[PDB]
């Protein structure tokens, strides 16, 4: 996928397939995820949305504390802090583009 090619945010280095491997190891996600790079107002941001597991149907307390490891780990590996959604399963596109990219070249 281009979940191999690196991308930059912020003068960072970040190879994707980094994400990837973190959010697999955990029970409760499933294996569809996407990184979206985008330019907020004046700076980027990227979003990280997961799909979680169809097996997890727990309490919003317990969502959040996912949401947090997740964050917490994925900031550890590629060096900024990433925002983290939660996402139901199917909600992303199965038709392997891994990462979008909604910044200008430029």
């Given at each position: 996928?281009n979940?191999?090619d ?15 491997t973190?959010?697999?190891?955990f029970?409760e996600?499933g ?5 979206t ?8 941001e ?12 727990d ?17 550890d590996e590629?060096?900024v802090?990433?925002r983290?959604?939660l996402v ?8 392997a ?6 910044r200008?070249?430029?």
């Amino acid at each position: 996928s281009n979940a191999d090619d690196m991308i930059i945010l912020k003068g960072v280095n970040i190879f994707p397939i980094q994400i990837e491997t973190i959010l697999l190891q955990f029970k409760e996600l499933g294996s569809d995820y996407l990184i979206t790079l985008e330019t907020a107002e004046s700076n980027d941001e990227m979003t990280v949305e997961v799909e979680l597991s169809q097996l997890f149907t727990d309490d919003y307390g317990r969502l959040q504390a996912l949401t947090r490891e997740i964050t917490r780990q994925l900031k550890d590996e590629i060096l900024v802090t990433p925002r983290v959604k939660l996402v139901p399963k199917g909600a992303l596109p199965k038709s392997a583009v891994r990462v979008k990219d909604l910044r200008k070249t430029f």
